[PDB]
Design a protein around this ligand. Structure first.
Ligand SMILES: NC(=O)C1=CN([C@@H]2O[C@H](COP(=O)(O)OP(=O)(O)OC[C@H]3O[C@@H](n4cnc5c(N)ncnc54)[C@H](O)[C@@H]3O)[C@@H](O)[C@H]2O)[C@@H](O)CC1
Ligand SMILES: NC(=O)C1=CN([C@@H]2O[C@H](COP(=O)(O)OP(=O)(O)OC[C@H]3O[C@@H](n4cnc5c(N)ncnc54)[C@H](O)[C@@H]3O)[C@@H](O)[C@H]2O)[C@@H](O)CC1
Ligand SMILES: NC(=O)C1=CN([C@@H]2O[C@H](COP(=O)(O)OP(=O)(O)OC[C@H]3O[C@@H](n4cnc5c(N)ncnc54)[C@H](O)[C@@H]3O)[C@@H](O)[C@H]2O)[C@@H](O)CC1
Ligand SMILES: NC(=O)C1=CN([C@@H]2O[C@H](COP(=O)(O)OP(=O)(O)OC[C@H]3O[C@@H](n4cnc5c(N)ncnc54)[C@H](O)[C@@H]3O)[C@@H](O)[C@H]2O)C=CC1
Ligand SMILES: NC(=O)C1=CN([C@@H]2O[C@H](COP(=O)(O)OP(=O)(O)OC[C@H]3O[C@@H](n4cnc5c(N)ncnc54)[C@H](O)[C@@H]3O)[C@@H](O)[C@H]2O)C=CC1
Ligand SMILES: NC(=O)C1=CN([C@@H]2O[C@H](COP(=O)(O)OP(=O)(O)OC[C@H]3O[C@@H](n4cnc5c(N)ncnc54)[C@H](O)[C@@H]3O)[C@@H](O)[C@H]2O)C=CC1
Ligand SMILES: [K+]
Ligand SMILES: [K+]
Ligand SMILES: [K+]
Lengths: 6, 490, 490, 490, 6, 6, 6
């Protein structure tokens, strides 16, 4: 979760 | 706009533009790795424009050098922005190869295309060698990874500007853009990853338009306290149906029941009212005496009476569209002092002045064909037109739910986009269910905007849980899947 | 040095120092996430010095802001370097909280400590509030993540400079440092992740000292062509054993056989030679007639004769250390024109002038007690002293394998560090096996440096595959596990 | 010869040569499908010479047309045989594309190479464009399927004629050829499939040289009737060992026991005889009093006495090779009227006149180094020289077991080839075990040729069942695996 | 088994 | 593998 | 698939 949201 | 957000992050927070660009590029590399696995055997063709999208591209290319089987940059612009120029310079200093001429056969020696031609700076139609190259990429069958937005999609609208790249994966920065959410852009985006590139979280959270997520719907679902009874969960009246359309009332009524409403009554012309209970005897279906099979002013007083003992009224599914219906709908909505959910044929005869004079709230649920007739524009001018939706909601003091593969929900201040669902909802009846769902959540205590947000999400999610091919989904099966959608959401 | 590498990457390649620092900090965040899972519930205490290690720290803290439950920076320095100053400034602009006073109770409100006090810029012993705080962290039981190197470890030697942080996880940049590889540093590092922060790959690969990896050993293992016979895989002679030490020859001989050598002969004083074949009848064990149970000059001619028909000779395990042994070993090594693997009591009597005059290669396999006596220094001065090892190898034209929990392998130009193994090898006999392994790989065609690199890796890896508690591992069980190590390596 | 078999099948049985060629080609297609799965996505490059191998090639190419993604034939010959000409004609009539010029880059557009350049008609070294093309194929990394034999392998000997194709799969017709069985040919063949192309079964079965199969060994294994005792399963004496080689007797003795022999006695110089029982107390190990640690004529009468009460005598492992051994071995074998298994140092001192005058049978088990010294030729002239082996066996009235990665077993009339085993047998001691196995099966009632056939198979199969890397296999572990080989064979 | 032996 | 070695 | 369709 820190780098990417979907 | 992300543009405002980049600028503030650079100029007021003091983050060097180059640091944001480096963070952008590396998030593309990590996204590719997550999607392709180990990158080391692949050959990469990075297509860079002269803007900051291209600069992100150069960061990607530089970071692959020496770690993958091959990297080539085709630089397609004329001038370079300062950050693109800096990163081109680094790419070359690190040993990278750039060409400025594009060969039709070039695609053959590469496995992955990184599309860093145009991002949010696209203006106007794509032509020339830009177009030729995008068309060559689209015919190539290679894996396509787009930087920020697929080149050729207008990031504010999702429209294709003559031609656009079709991506397997798009990596976007900070927030999704409207062009990833609306079609055709949504389709060309392929799988979307939203990367954190170091904007302050406060700026990211301040965007006024967004996608309805599972977490947002989870926190809006009403509470089910154990010490409750049917009155806890409200009452809905549905005014629906006609001699022509005896099934629509049933789909709406069960829509209300399946989302947890305590009591649902239909008012439907006799004998069509009896259809509902023959199929779902838990429904109450009140017979309305009509002259010719349609609601008219002769039924005004009975409906207003039935309305006194409910929390919300839905009107419109299956009513028919003729003059006696038109007179009834408008006089009724003018006098009704309850929240109204207005769909289908009630929209088709609606005098919008009536919305303006109502003190009570309303939600309107048109498809674009109905919205077009309502505002007297063409379908193509209202479809995905979220600014028109906002202006309409604000001027008429309502919530507008404009249904399509991506559904827009707005009260004029806040606009939400729904992306659950599939083509099994592109079939008559699916709308009638949604109308019931919305009225149901209003009866349980959600605001009209909240009820609408939760309903469009769950309605789409229920379609996705159908076990067989989506084109076979019918409204009755949709109803059965609602409580499974609710369970999975929790 | 990473210092040379940072400088060149900034000054010659043109990467802004701030971009390297941002990449460093975010790689710490991603490493923490990989290790802890979702970070959002955790509370972080980031301890920053005034150098660039602290600056990396500020990048970490800034990137956690708004995404985790809590972040606090304790800034412990006086002045800030320019990049630390820039990143402190960003951390504060983004809303971050910094204090300069450290409270003993502070540890109580945090779950994770990020240690960004000192990195490779540590000079001299840690004292004062630096020491007090490190000691408080070490007593706290919190999760400790060190930036680059645990503060207090000398990154060039692995020594503790008065006190040092004990980390669960260390994230280092570009290449592992010597202080993560040698003890006590290796122990204080905990789990080590090496992050790519954007140095050119050419610079990263140019470091002259490194860890022996699985991939390096895989590519060095000799080929086993199907059309082969025992002569394909060479012949070893082992000159070993005495009336005192009848078992050492056996462990060495089987060490050679288990790595794939075609033929192994021992020369061992009678009747002790018979011990070997009673246990492993595949060995050939030649009886040597001695006066008193030890090799002497009376046996010189027979051993040189036995040596004519072999590819490599190992000498020393179990020979004993007395004057007749000393005369034999030195005269033999002076006349032998084959590669020699020199261990144990052959090292203990070795005249190093003999190594200088030999035309043929040699590998020496001392433990630090034997190396100390060889160069006439204390154990503590030779232990982990890779510069002394290098100088020795270069001056005597040999390969030096200095055995310890981390084993140093060097020919004076290239130095490799082995980190496989466990404390089951800290037991007599484990060395005797390794001597056989090395001779074996030389017989199969590897160079002395290659044979040594492969053997120390596989020897340590075999110990790790023991199924029960490592302290119960004995040399006989070690032998059985060698061919499983080889299979798993492939 | 398959040539005799093709001719008879055409000229006497009346099968059209074209029908055999069609059957050959289609069996290649089916073999490729079995190995690659569905062929339809693959692109095929078929390299055809002008002979019948090329004609088979044309059949392959024609049968792929319209069913795979692409087929191209490069025809490399000058003239075409009639069947090659006919099939070239069909390939073209069916729409196939042929080129006669070979491009270095051609390999790039194809996934599979079908090698139909030369089969059994190869004569002399490959040079010119034939060589260049084969070398280009070997560097290409494509899947290579050879028709009949990899082009460049001499099908009668397995030798490489300057250069040869390295195949993933070879499809051969009727029977395997000697060149698929002996190395280097065996290695270049890759996976071998033997296709039935319609030869009468009587002709196929009449070939005098063949591979030892699992079924052949299963039907030769002696019976174990339940009402039996140790005497049922025979007695072996092993005359072996010396002061130099105390372990070899043990490996031979246990070799006999592990294949089911009822009683095994060793005669070994004292005190080396005691080594055997210290390790395997089930062995009987008789002390022989010697002058200097080696058998001599002083021991003749005792050994002949020990021989009266046994079924078979093995002699040679570990005896040493000196004059007193030579006199003993020859006088003993001249007087012994029992079957003898003659290995190792007994071969090295053997006077072959003694074999000629013996009435009793013998089996000899040399490696090529020992065979070379026995017949006074170079290793390279005896290695894989099955005609020399046959002539030797016939002239000396013995069975010859010439050990190598492929082992040749012959009595001069019948010659069998063993292909089980791996490089774990390329290590001292593995031979000593085999000697025991052979004597063991003779003691149980198999003929010398039968005992040898079964033993070489099972010995190789036992090596393959070792659980860890083969290069770590030692003779002691080999012994443990024999009874598992026996179980798996049944 | 009819077509192929291994 | 792009970001981390162990 | 080369030899047989079902
Ligand atoms: N089982 C039933 O009883 C059903 C009754 N239904 C009722 O049928 C009545 C008429 O509804 P309709 O939507 O068919 O027609 P409308 O008159 O509301 O639609 C306006 C026009 O738009 C077009 N159109 C239809 N769906 C569209 C879309 N998704 N996007 C763009 N254009 C579209 C059609 O040409 C249609 O004439 C309503 O009262 C509705 O409730 C429908 O819901 C279908 C099922
Ligand atoms: N089963 C056997 O036959 C065994 C025989 N061995 C033989 O014993 C002989 C003497 O070898 P040792 O190493 O015991 O003594 P050495 O005389 O070689 O060692 C020098 C001194 O260093 C100390 N020491 C031992 N191991 C050390 C280490 N790992 N680090 C630092 N100091 C250490 C001891 O006090 C020792 O006296 C050699 O010939 C060796 O091959 C040993 O390998 C043990 C097993
Ligand atoms: N554990 C033991 O007690 C062992 C004893 N062994 C004994 O050692 C004695 C000598 O046997 P070797 O075979 O070593 O020497 P030999 O003297 O029988 O071999 C003739 C020569 O051929 C070469 N050679 C060895 N193996 C070869 C192969 N597979 N192909 C081609 N050339 C080869 C060597 O240079 C050797 O000198 C025999 O009595 C044998 O039984 C060997 O079996 C090894 C194990
Ligand atoms: N921030 C990062 O940078 C990007 C924004 O960078 P900017 O430099 O603002 O914009 P940009 O890199 O998206 O594109 C602007 C560049 O494309 C050119 N361009 C725009 N439309 C064109 C058309 N129709 N035909 C030909 N050329 C055209 C402009 O001249 C300029 O070179 C974001 O998408 C994100 O990647
Ligand atoms: N590059 C990144 O930056 C780091 C290197 O940064 P630099 O600024 O070179 O060094 P650094 O940040 O490792 O440490 C230097 C700082 O610590 C102080 N210092 C060193 N030893 C000390 C001691 N024994 N007692 C008290 N203070 C002491 C120095 O005054 C300076 O403030 C790398 O480790 C990596 O993190
Ligand atoms: N029966 C099937 O047909 C095959 C036997 O067919 P044949 O026509 O007997 O033989 P073949 O097709 O194996 O090869 C004979 C052809 O190769 C040529 N050739 C042989 N050695 C050569 C060399 N060293 N350099 C250049 N050219 C050379 C001959 O001139 C002739 O064109 C079997 O292998 C099987 O496939
Ligand atoms: K793009
Ligand atoms: K640190
Ligand atoms: K061929």
């Amino acid at each position: 979760a820190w780098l990417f949201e979907a | 706009h992300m543009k405002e957000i980049d600028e503030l992050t650079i100029k007021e927070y003091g983050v060097d533009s180059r640091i944001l660009m480096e963070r952008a590029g590396i998030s593309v590399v990590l996204a590719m790795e997550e999607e392709l696995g180990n990158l080391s055997d692949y050959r990469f063709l990075v297509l860079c424009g002269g803007g900051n999208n291209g600069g992100d591209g150069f960061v990607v290319a530089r970071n692959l050098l020496g770690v993958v089987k091959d990297v080539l940059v085709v630089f397609l612009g004329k001038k370079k922005t300062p950050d693109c120029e800096y990163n081109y310079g680094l790419y070359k200093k690190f040993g990278g190869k750039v060409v400025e001429q594009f060969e039709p056969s070039i695609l053959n020696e590469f496995d992955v295309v990184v599309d860093a031609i145009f991002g949010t700076g696209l203006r106007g139609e794509i032509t020339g060698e830009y177009a030729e190259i995008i068309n060559l990429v689209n015919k190539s069958g290679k894996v396509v990874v787009s930087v920020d937005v697929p080149s050729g999609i207008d990031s504010n609208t999702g429209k294709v500007l003559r031609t656009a790249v079709k991506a397997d994966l798009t990596v976007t920065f900070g927030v999704p853009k409207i062009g990833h959410i609306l079609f055709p852009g949504r389709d060309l985006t392929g799988k979307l990853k939203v990367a954190n590139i170091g904007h302050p979280v406060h700026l990211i959270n301040s965007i006024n338009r967004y996608v309805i997520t599972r977490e947002m719907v989870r926190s809006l679902l009403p509470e089910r306290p154990r010490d409750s009874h049917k009155g806890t969960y409200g009452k809905v009246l549905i005014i629906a149906g006609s001699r022509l359309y005896s099934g629509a009332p049933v789909l709406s009524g069960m829509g209300s029941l399946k989302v947890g409403t305590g009591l649902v009554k239909l008012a439907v012309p006799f004998p069509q009212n009896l259809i509902a209970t023959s199929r779902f005897p838990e429904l109450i279906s009140v017979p309305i005496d009509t002259e010719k099979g349609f609601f008219s002013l002769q039924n005004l007083q009975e409906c207003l009476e039935l309305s006194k003992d409910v929390d919300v009224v839905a009107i419109g599914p299956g009513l028919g569209n003729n003059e006696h219906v038109r007179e009834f709908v408008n006089e009724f909505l003018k006098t009704l002092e309850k929240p109204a959910v207005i769909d289908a044929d009630a929209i088709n005869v609606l005098d919008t002045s009536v919305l303006k004079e109502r003190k009570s709230p309303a939600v309107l649920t048109p498809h674009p064909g109905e919205m077009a007739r309502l505002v007297k524009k063409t379908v193509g001018d209202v479809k995905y037109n979220y600014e028109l939706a906002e202006e309409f909601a604000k001027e008429n003091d309502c919530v507008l739910v404009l249904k399509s593969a991506t559904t827009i929900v707005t009260d004029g201040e806040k606009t939400l986009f729904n992306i659950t669902g599939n083509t099994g909802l592109s079939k008559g009846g699916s709308g009638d269910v949604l109308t019931g769902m919305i009225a149901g959540f209003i009866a349980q205590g959600l605001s009209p905007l909240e009820a609408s947000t939760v309903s469009v999400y769950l309605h789409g999610f229920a379609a996705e849980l159908f076990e067989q091919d989506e084109r076979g989904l019918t409204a009755s099966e949709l109803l059965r899947l609602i409580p499974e959608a609710i369970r999975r959401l929790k």
